[PDB]
Amino acid sequence: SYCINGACAFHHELEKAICRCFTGYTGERCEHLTLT
């Protein structure tokens, strides 16, 4: 539920959850629509 519009992947060295967003989203939790 963390990544709103993306796949979640954990960096254990950073101890941080990184969201890899989908086709037309961006942001930390993939909560922003990409602005062209």
């Binding site: 960096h11 950073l14 942001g27 939790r29 990409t34 602005l35 062209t36």
Partner: protein, 501 residues
């Protein structure tokens, strides 16, 4: 003066694709010598060229170099990291993970990095990092932070060259004589109160010198420790007011200068405004707002036109928040000026379990009816399909765009269900592009004469993929007959930009 940029505050967030992120970085630090904020280098890949970074001489905030896979990052002339803002509450320089196997971030030839005024450093997991394990950080970092130093150097690639023998104690930033570490602090004399040029007491640097000097006077510093005049380093800028001891009265100083970053300037540049403490800020944001007094911008206390100043999403009590919420909305009650940015996202109307945020009741958007000024940008990527216009911002008058969305857009109406914009009171968009796209029912957007609202030359408009002009013409949804060729925010006479109500 030097060429300046603002930097970034994105941390380990990526923008778009690798090419998009690289385009943003390159377009932000192009020919930048003074980074007023933070220098963030993330997600630089493969054989991407970063030789435009060789112009950077000083960074005020922090420098976060992480998640890259490029073999070289040429911060060759980055002299000082002032560390006025930390990363993760500790470090002013953070070289975190930068491996793909063992290839990537091999050469970090920061030959002239000699001063870290505040904060500590963190090197964590860089298998290809080559010659940074040899650097003595006692010379660069202040002693007060030497306890928080988290240095890690376990090299898997093991292809790194050896330092030049001319480098003292084998300390080199990279291979070669030019890449020898220059010690300007721990190789001084007991008489030197700061940096030095050599071991003898005749080589002490001025107290206002940071990261070394070329002579003994205060006009010979490599970079000033506090404030820089035209050529002289100073502990403070020439005050705007001076105490008169004969009349016992503060008089106006004819040679006073405001504080622009780390320089003393006779006038705050554009998109900046003086304060009551003689410092240029990007925008007034505490209990003040922008005013035109003496023909110059000043931060005046909230009185008269201003009724209440409130923080935007991202800073203040709204920091680490993503948009306006069922719990955010209440605190926006009766605010007239927003000190920062405004975000409206679909997660606001769908709710978020991760933050225990229930859906936002649409009617509560009416709280924003008192907002008449936004210092940053206005981003609307979600709106009640039930509503037909942006009636919440009916009385919004000006968007300054001091902070812009991705460094570009000060207004962003995207993928809404509105038929008109309804920004009847909007009269000025000071700086920043305007993008209006995906609003498949919006009509009158292209009628507006946006040049009449822009204040800065070069502002662009990206108004595309809404509703067709002929589609609105064949429906009567056009600007009112009482309107002017300047356009309209809707079908009513009160929506005209000129000859309005």
């Amino acid at each position: 003066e030097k060429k300046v940029c603002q930097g970034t505050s994105n941390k380990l967030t990526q923008l778009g694709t690798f090419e998009d992120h690289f385009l943003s970085l390159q377009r932000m630090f192009n020919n930048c010598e003074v980074v007023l904020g933070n220098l963030e280098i993330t997600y630089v890949q493969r054989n991407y060229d970063l030789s435009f970074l060789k112009t950077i001489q000083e960074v005020a905030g922090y420098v976060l170099i992480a998640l890259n896979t490029v073999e070289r990052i040429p911060l060759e002339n980055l002299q000082i990291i002032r560390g006025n803002m930390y990363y993760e509450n500790s470090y002013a320089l953070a070289v975190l993970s930068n491996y793909d196997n063992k290839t990537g971030l091999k050469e970090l030839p920061m030959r002239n990095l000699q001063e870290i005024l505040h904060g500590a450093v963190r090197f964590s997991n860089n298998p290809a990092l080559c010659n940074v394990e040899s650097i003595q950080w006692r010379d660069i970092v202040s002693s007060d932070f030497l306890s928080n130093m988290s240095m890690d150097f376990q090299n898997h690639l093991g292809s790194c060259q050896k330092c030049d023998p001319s480098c003292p104690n084998g300390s080199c930033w990279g291979a070669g004589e030019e890449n020898c570490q220059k010690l300007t602090k721990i190789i001084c004399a007991q008489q030197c109160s700061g940096r030095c040029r050599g071991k003898s007491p005749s080589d002490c640097c001025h107290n206002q010198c940071a990261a070394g000097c070329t002579g003994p006077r205060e006009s010979d510093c490599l970079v000033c420790r506090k404030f820089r005049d035209e050529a002289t380093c100073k502990d403070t800028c020439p005050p705007l007011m001076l105490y008169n001891p004969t009349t016992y009265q503060m008089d106006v100083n004819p040679e006073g200068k405001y504080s622009f970053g780390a320089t003393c300037v006779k006038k705050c540049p554009r998109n900046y405004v003086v304060t009551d403490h003689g410092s240029c800020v990007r925008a007034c944001g505490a209990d003040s707002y922008e005013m035109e007094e003496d023909g110059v911008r000043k931060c005046k206390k909230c009185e008269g036109p201003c009724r209440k100043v409130c923080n935007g999403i991202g800073i203040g009590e709204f920091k680490d928040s993503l948009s306006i919420n069922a719990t955010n909305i209440k605190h926006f009650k009766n605010c007239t000026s927003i000190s920062g940015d405004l975000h409206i996202l679909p997660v606001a109307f769908r709710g978020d379990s991760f933050t225990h945020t229930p859906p936002l009741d649409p009617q509560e958007l009416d709280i924003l009816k008192t907002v008449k000024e936004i210092t940053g940008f206005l981003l609307i990527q979600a709106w009640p399909e039930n509503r037909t216009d942006l009636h919440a911002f009916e009385n919004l008058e000006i968007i300054r765009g001091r902070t812009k969305q991705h460094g570009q857009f000060s207004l962003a109406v995207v993928s809404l269900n509105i038929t008109s914009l309804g920004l009847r009171s909007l009269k000025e968009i000071s700086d920043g592009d305007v993008i209006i796209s995906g609003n498949k029912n919006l009509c009158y957007a292209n009628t507006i004469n946006w040049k009449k609202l822009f204040g800065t030359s070069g502002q662009k408009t990206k108004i595309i993929s809404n509703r067709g002009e002929n589609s609105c013409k064949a429906t009567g949804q056009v600007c009112h007959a009482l309107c002017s060729p300047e356009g309209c925010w809707g079908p009513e006479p009160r929506d005209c930009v000129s000859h309005h109500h």
